[PDB]
């Protein structure tokens, strides 16, 4: 029933990004800047919705204690700029009924109602300690990495892992990006 924001994201900001590790959902933030899970390990080029695009720059986010945050910020060598969604990034997440918007592998155009979310903090994510993790009790799937955790007019984070009973997103913060 409440899909307008997710559909808007899918139409202007959410992509399928292919690396040598496979397909991931990716989120364009502003300009030519997008995010993908760090374990996607993007190379010098990626596929964006199937089209080969050179990676102008990339870097992995870590916190001030050098702990993995599991987000990699990519700058794409493409002319088109993303619709600016920096103003929707929200840390206002405790107890909100959130949605995952997925566009990769066998879950394209996919909207998941993951329920209330909370900050879990530090998690052992596939043997890498990872901070600023947001948790939901929902069954997630191998093909959904990169899914955008959001609510109406709010973007909370990016899905990066799970175990079939609980899923985890890397928190997105406005401070990760050029101020808008």
């Amino acid at each position, epitope marked *: 029933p409440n899909t307008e924001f997710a559909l808007s994201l899918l139409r202007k900001n959410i992509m399928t990004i292919t690396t040598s590790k496979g397909e991931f959902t990716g989120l364009g933030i502003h300009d030519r800047v997008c995010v993908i899970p760090t374990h996607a390990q993007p190379g010098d080029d990626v596929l964006v919705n199937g089209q080969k695009i050179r990676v102008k720059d990339k870097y992995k986010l870590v916190d001030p204690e050098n702990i993995n945050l599991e987000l990699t910020v990519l700058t794409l060598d493409r002319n088109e700029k993303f619709r600016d969604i920096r103003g929707f990034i929200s840390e206002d997440l405790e107890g909100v009924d959130a949605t995952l918007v997925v566009h990769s592998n066998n879950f394209t155009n996919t909207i998941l109602e993951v329920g209330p979310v909370t900050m879990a903090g530090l998690i052992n994510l596939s043997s890498t300690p990872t901070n600023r993790m947001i948790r939901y009790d929902y*069954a997630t799937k191998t093909g959904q990495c990169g899914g955008v955790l959001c609510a109406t007019g709010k973007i909370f984070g990016i899905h990066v892992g799970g175990n079939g009973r609980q899923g985890f997103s890397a928190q997105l913060k406005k401070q990760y990006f050029v101020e808008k």
Partner: antibody
Amino acid sequence: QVQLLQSGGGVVQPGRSLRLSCAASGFTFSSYAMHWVRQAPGKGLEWVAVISYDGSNKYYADSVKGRFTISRDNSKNTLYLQMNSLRAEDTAVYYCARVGKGGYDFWSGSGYMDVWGKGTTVTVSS
Amino acid sequence: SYVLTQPPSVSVSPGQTASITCSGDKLGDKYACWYQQKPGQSPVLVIYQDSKRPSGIPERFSGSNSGNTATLTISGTQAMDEADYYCQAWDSSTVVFGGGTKLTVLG
């Protein structure tokens, strides 16, 4: 309050057409993909067809593709399955069902089915 | 054609745990849901998105999905649970029902 009221069906001669219909009430019909699912006598549930929330995407099981058409009227909260070129193997109870909002693909209409109609018996006299 | 397999029948006495499975290639990478169907009635959703219970569904029903197999467990089976149970898988390209399992509750 949430209701899928089905109508149509009966005995039909092979090669002919029959329209099944469903009137939806108690929810925002235009926001949901809808499926038809059928069950032959003493057999299991079999997916038949899907139409996406706005009617723009339609898919059919191999068993009925090229014969049946699915359609919807989001102003009259109605769903239709037009069964054409009927064959003996189409004999079944036909249910329509709403795709639940807990997790779904809004383009293909794939998902799980959280509300079912009572079912309409179609018997092909062949 | 993607095929989902279920055992034809399960039987338990009241209070026992009943376990009904459905299997298919990489089912654990798709979503599994479960429907209960009593004679002469429409299916009723009892588990969705692998493990979630709709409101009104008794807590004795639980679900899991991993590898190639989804499992519906009834912990403390009741006489009124006698029914056919159908698993259904979905992903973007998939809506498929398993063949069904007849659950008899006896003695």
